[PDB]
Ligand binder design. Structure first.
Ligand SMILES: Nc1ncnc2c1ncn2[C@@H]1O[C@H](COP(=O)(O)OP(=O)(O)OP(=O)(O)O)[C@@H](O)[C@H]1O
Ligand SMILES: [Mg+2]
Ligand SMILES: [Mg+2]
Lengths: 985, 76, 147, 75
């Protein structure tokens, strides 16, 4: 009973069983500061049964540094009481409660216990109980630019899925007597040693089809081994194999036992000596707090740092830790003890919330057991960071001033950022900017653009939007929400509903871009990313890119004149199947789903568009007769949808649907089997219908069958929608109408001058005149996956399953059909939080204006396996032009609006190069091989005039520059690459 | 020399290489074992992204070293 | 994309393809019109076939869209001009030039592949009644590919 | 005897062969003259693809016959 209208994207990551187990689990959260509130928000969005909060500490001003559910009117009130009311709104299926006191025996009510802002003695007391009663325990801590996570799920934790990947499946070609399984031609199984597989449809070895898993011994990318199958047979042909994923048992140690001998998870392999340092440092922090009435070391205080280092020495000696303590790093941990950054809180909250979901669902591999992280490369170096600048000012930014200082706060307050997109990452980024105080100064400003509107499925991970906001623009709602979070942003945010692309260069022009400080992408497609990257490269602005997919995510930074751009690298492209495979010989459900989508377009979209265009354009027929690749098809569509097969009631729609069923599931298969009988052979004597080709069988219409009736209903309903008729859903009318149907006879056809044009003319003049039909239009069907009442996904599912039944393929359900046909991207709130945290950790590096390339980090992570990795950005390539060092990416030529002849002469005299090709946009302005007359005509014109003439379109008034690509040859004739040209109009 | 490559999806790959091999040879071996074109591979060792034209000894990649094979993602 | 396309165009200009001639339409670099000459020792002898090539914005990282504009009676070319070629759907790499695609199309014209067809009826005629296929191909190339 | 091999670019290569010569020898000659690996050679005669292990006489190849050299593409 999972509400798929809300958890649509999350079910594609977790699944139905996982979320069913989640909906029966209770989570207790101790601590309601930024980290705790982040964890609680992610858990509430995920969909656990309930959340309980425990934090009786009265609110303080500094707590607003990362707590976005606290306002300045809540000072002096316990944090939990003022946070519960705002947390209760995120999800209506997840109650949120508050407990004024905790007793140990009270912990047995909860499936998971999360602990933050708690001393080590209390953590030991809680864990000593939770461990022996088999309750998952997570403890998180965030001190300045340092963070720690600890997980303990019990001694006998059972993990059903360890990586979150779909089971591997493949098509076999032959299995020898010794178990050597071979894949089809140029096909990779993708298995690893120790996996288990089960076979089906294996001919010659029926014993393998029982369904018993067998060990896999990989012997190459195309073959593997399963053991000895001597008894089961001599050789097997064809068949399919599917991977079997077996449960694993993970055994955790208690906190008391794991303090002495910890097990580390390394977020970065470049610094593998640090986590042992942080292990001592955090315990020393706890001891120091215990020795000073729970007070942490003061910011940038040397006396407190010395005392903290003495505590660290004592702890290291006590635990017999044979590690040499790095004094600088430990004292850095001491200095930033009171720091409270929203970016670190978001990062650790995403990680910890994912761990909570792992504990409650027994899915994915959990952290085992200590995860120590630092982002110490984000510490500013262009400002003064001392005890005087880092002391609190009694403002909401104390938690951040304790790390960065007041001068860096002034630098942050005067940023002018530009955020593209307002989805999940956009909302997280806006929240982080509001908490950090970005653009709250006199010269600060934020601009956010997004052309989409809020939908029900977006509320699962876009926490700034509520159900009352459905149907409104994302940017306005996000700006209002963040202005509520931080009132100082009132009047500092501007929201646009414009798509960023070539058509919006009049709004986001030179003036708009010249004032920015950085651009942050929150998009979901590669075309927009490339466009924004090109614009940033031209204007030389820093860019922050980030992306997510299920539990995976990445973040990249582009810095002018330092690193390469976003488009300098290539990603794997989308997979498109051969047209022959889709048309005639499918063997996967994806092929049939693609075929069904094409059928939907061809039945309910293209003919309607042709009919409408015929009744609007006065010269449509003549243009079509020589423009389209099949004018006969257009004429037939117009005739059929206007006169021949125009329905007058719903009964005719039902009859049409029955006829289409016959056409697409019974007759084309008969024709195909007439052309290639099931006993036919190839040119080499092999059987034709073998391997990837499956012999089909015609379907006979049976009303009682569920799939046939579903197809009839969906097709009739969509046809009625096209013609605007009143559809129905009662089976009585369908069964009554389809009873009196006489199928027209069909016999496959064996086949065996200029009169065709005369026939086309006769058909064309037979159509009713456009004048006779004025104000009459047919409504086309525009594909929409998120609506479960327009019959689109129903029709596609029914057609796909019927075609699978034709070729004996395993049918899918509406869930998988919607996933495949809709191109849905799995999404999670935890991954969004993690990527936003990383992006905001890079933003402070950008604000400081760091020059070295080793100080920046591109980040990648997969939360399903607990993998984090970072790497320096790639430096932009250099080149030699005329004996000068040129940056291939960030350098350009700046020239006036001169003539083409003058441009060529300038390039000859100055760079010593001969211009061979000159192009602008998608036009060829000049080429060395053009005829002399054309050049002599085009030489004395200015570049703007030449572009206008060639493109046959005047330049817009707002256009202030032209970008030209030039290919030139040296004196010797060797081609030399040069940067682009920027002509100033 | 034998090295290990871990993918962002959890898969593990074992490569037999030599310290004098270029990054191009390693990428070709990874393509053979995985089918990923060398121009679409992102290899990370000890916080450095490996670039074509250099050798393993330039990155101090020794036996039993672990590289990460990563890729960018389009959602968000 | 512009620089890659111009390099391909210049390379075509330098060394003639002999049996083919591709070039931009008007002045648009992302829309070419190529020509292919029917092999002499084939049913399409003495025929000129026009193809339209559409380079995507992501070239050379996505395949060009190549469609026949002349009607041809081939087991692997349907009525819309779609060509059943592996290097155009999923085997495309950013290392193949338009000249290679034209050579592949000429080879396809010189010998069809009826074991994995795109037009099952023409493939059936080719496999069963070869002489009728030859006559039909000659008739179609005389009716459409000449003039 | 003599035979002619036509390529995709309109070139004609003349070879001195005997009716008993194997297909492998002809592919070897084509590799020696043009440098095309035999594995990538697709030789066609009278609508039939020449297969290794046979002779020209098996295909009724006679004085001044014409063959076609094409690429290996299947799909
Ligand atoms: N070219 C663009 N210019 C501006 N905003 C864009 C552009 N392309 C996409 N966006 C916006 O970027 C955001 C992408 O985030 P996200 O993918 O989470 O949202 P969605 O596409 O609406 O949701 P879903 O993918 O879950 O159906 C959306 O607001 C989308 O409107
Ligand atoms: Mg949307
Ligand atoms: Mg989206």
């Amino acid at each position: 009973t999972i509400d798929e209208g809300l958890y649509s994207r999350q079910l594609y990551v977790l699944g139905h069983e996982a979320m069913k187990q989640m909906s029966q689990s209770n989570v207790l959260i101790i601590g309601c500061k930024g980290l705790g509130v982040e964890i609680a928000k992610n858990v509430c969005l995920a969909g656990v049964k309930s959340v309980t909060l425990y934090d009786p500490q009265p609110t303080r001003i500094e707590d607003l540094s990362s707590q976005y559910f606290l306002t300045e009117d809540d000072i002096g009130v316990p944090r939990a009481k003022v946070t519960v009311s705002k947390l209760a709104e995120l999800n209506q299926y997840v109650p949120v409660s508050v407990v004024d006191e905790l007793s140990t025996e009270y912990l047995k009510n909860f499936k998971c216990v999360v602990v933050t802002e708690t001393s080590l003695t209390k953590q030991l007391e809680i864990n000593d109980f939770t461990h022996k009663n088999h309750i998952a325990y997570i403890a998180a801590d965030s001190r300045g630019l340092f963070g720690s996570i600890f997980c303990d799920f019990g001694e006998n934790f059972i993990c059903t899925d360890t990586d979150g990947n779909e089971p591997l499946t493949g098509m076999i070609a032959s299995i020898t007597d010794d178990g050597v399984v071979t894949m089809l031609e140029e096909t990779r199984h993708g298995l690893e040693n120790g996996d288990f597989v089960k076979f089906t449809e294996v001919k010659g070895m029926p014993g393998l089809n029982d369904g018993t898993p067998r060990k896999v011994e990989v012997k190459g990318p195309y073959t593997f081994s399963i053991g000895s199958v001597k008894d089961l047979g001599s050789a097997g042909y064809n068949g399919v194999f599917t991977q079997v994923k077996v449960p694993t048992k993970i055994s955790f140690k208690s906190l008391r036992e794991s303090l002495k001998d910890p097990e580390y998870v390394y977020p970065d392999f470049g610094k593998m000596m640090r986590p042992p340092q942080y292990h001592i440092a955090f315990q020393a922090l706890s001891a120091f707090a215990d020795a000073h009435e729970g007070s942490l070391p003061r910011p940038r205080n040397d006396i407190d740092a010395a005392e903290f280092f003495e505590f660290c020495k004592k702890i290291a000696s006590t635990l017999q830790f044979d590690v040499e303590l790095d004094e600088k790093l430990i004292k850095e941990i001491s200095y930033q003890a009171r720091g409270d950054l929203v970016a670190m809180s978001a990062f650790l909250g995403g990680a910890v919330a994912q761990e909570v979901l792992k504990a409650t669902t027994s899915k994915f591999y959990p952290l085992k057991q200590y995860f120590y992280f630092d982002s110490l490369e984000s510490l500013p170096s262009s400002v003064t960071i001392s005890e005087e600048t880092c002391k609190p000012r009694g403002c909401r930014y104390d938690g951040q001033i304790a790390v960065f200082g007041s001068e860096f706060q002034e630098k942050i307050a005067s940023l002018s950022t530009f955020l593209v997109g307002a989805g999940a990452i956009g909302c997280e980024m806006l929240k982080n900017w509001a908490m950090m105080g970005v653009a709250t100064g006199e010269s600060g400003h934020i601009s956010v653009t997004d052309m989409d509107s809020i939908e029900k499925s977006n509320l699962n991970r876009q926490f700034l939007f509520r159900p009352r906001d459905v149907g409104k623009l994302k940017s306005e709602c996000a700006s209002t929400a963040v202005s509520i979070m931080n009132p100082s942003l009132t009047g500092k945010i501007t929201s646009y509903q414009e798509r960023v692309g070539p058509e919006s260069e009049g709004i986001f022009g030179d003036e708009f871009f010249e004032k920015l400080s950085l651009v942050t992408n929150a998009l979901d497609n590669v075309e927009a990313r490339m466009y924004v990257d090109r614009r940033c490269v031209f204007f030389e602005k820093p860019l922050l890119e980030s992306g997510t997919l299920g539990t995976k995510g990445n973040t990249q930074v582009v810095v002018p004149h330092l690193t390469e751009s976003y488009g300098s690298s290539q990603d794997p492209p989308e997979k498109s199947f051969p047209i022959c495979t889709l048309k005639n010989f499918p063997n996967r459900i994806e092929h049939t789903i693609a075929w069904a989508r094409d059928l939907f377009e061809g039945l309910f979209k293209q003919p309607i568009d042709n009919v409408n265009m015929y009744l609007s354009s006065p010269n449509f027929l003549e243009t079509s007769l020589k423009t389209s690749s099949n004018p006969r098809e257009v004429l037939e569509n117009i005739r059929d949808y206007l006169v021949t097969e125009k329905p007058l009631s719903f009964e005719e729609c039902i009859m049409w649907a029955r006829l289409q069923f016959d056409k697409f599931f019974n007759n084309n298969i008969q024709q195909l089997l007439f052309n290639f009988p099931k006993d036919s052979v190839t040119s080499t004597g092999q059987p034709f219908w073998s391997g990837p080709k499956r012999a089909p069988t015609p379907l006979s219409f049976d009303i009682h069958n569920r799939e046939h009736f579903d197809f009839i209903v969906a097709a009739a309903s969509l046809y009625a929608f096209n013609y605007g008729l009143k559809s129905e859903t009662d089976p009585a009318i369908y069964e009554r109408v389809l009873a009196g149907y006489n199928p027209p006879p069909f016999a496959p056809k064996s086949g065996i001058a200029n009169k065709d044009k005369q026939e086309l003319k006769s058909i064309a003049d037979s159509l009713p005149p456009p004048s006779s039909l004025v104000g009459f239009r047919l409504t086309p069907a525009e594909f929409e996956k998120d609506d479960d009442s327009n019959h689109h996904i129903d029709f596609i599912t029914a057609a796909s399953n019927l075609r699978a039944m034709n070729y004996d393929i395993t049918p899918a359900d509406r869930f998988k059909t919607k996933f495949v046909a809709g191109k849905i991207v799995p999404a999670m709130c935890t991954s969004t939080a993690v990527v936003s945290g990383l992006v905001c950790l890079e933003l402070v590096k950008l604000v400081d204006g760091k020059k070295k390339i080793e100080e920046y980090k591109n980040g990648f992570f997969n939360l399903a396996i607990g993998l984090f990795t970072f790497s320096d950005p790639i430096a932009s390539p250099k080149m030699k032009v005329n004996g000068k060092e040129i940056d291939k990416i960030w350098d350009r030529y700046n020239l006036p609006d001169c003539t083409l002849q003058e441009l060529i002469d300038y390039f000859q005299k100055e760079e010593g190069l001969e211009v061979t090709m000159l192009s602008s946009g998608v036009s060829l302005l000049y080429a060395n091989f053009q005829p002399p007359k054309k050049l002599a005509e085009r030489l004395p014109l200015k570049i703007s005039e030449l572009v206008e003439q060639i493109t046959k379109k005047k330049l817009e008034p707002f256009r202030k520059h032209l970008v030209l690509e030039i290919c030139c040859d040296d004196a010797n004739g060797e081609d030399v690459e040069v940067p682009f040209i920027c002509i100033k109009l | 020399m034998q090295i290990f490559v871990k993918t962002l999806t959890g898969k593990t790959i074992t490569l037999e290489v030599e310290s004098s091999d270029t990054i191009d040879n390693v990428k070709s071996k990874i393509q053979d074992k995985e089918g990923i074109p060398p121009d679409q591979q992102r290899l990370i060792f000890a916080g450095k992204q490996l670039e074509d034209g250099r050798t393993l000894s330039d990155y101090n990649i020794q036996k039993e070293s672990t590289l990460h094979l990563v890729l960018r993602l389009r959602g968000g | 994309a512009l620089k890659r396309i111009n390099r391909e165009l210049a390379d075509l200009g330098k060394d003639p393809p002999s049996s083919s001639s591709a070039g931009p339409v008007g002045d648009d670099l992302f829309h070419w019109q190529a020509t292919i000459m029917g092999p002499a020792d084939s049913p399409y002898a003495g025929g000129v076939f026009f193809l339209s090539i559409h380079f995507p914005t992501d070239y050379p990282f996505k395949p060009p869209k190549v469609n026949f504009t002349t009607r041809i009676y081939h087991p692997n070319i349907n009525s819309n001009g779609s060509i059943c070629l592996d290097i155009l759907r999923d085997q495309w790499s950013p290392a193949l030039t338009i000249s290679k695609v034209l050579l592949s199309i000429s080879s396809l014209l010189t010998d069809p592949n009826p074991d994995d067809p795109l037009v099952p009826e023409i493939a059936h005629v080719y496999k069963t009644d070869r002489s009728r296929y030859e006559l039909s191909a000659r008739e179609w190339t005389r009716k459409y590919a000449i003039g």
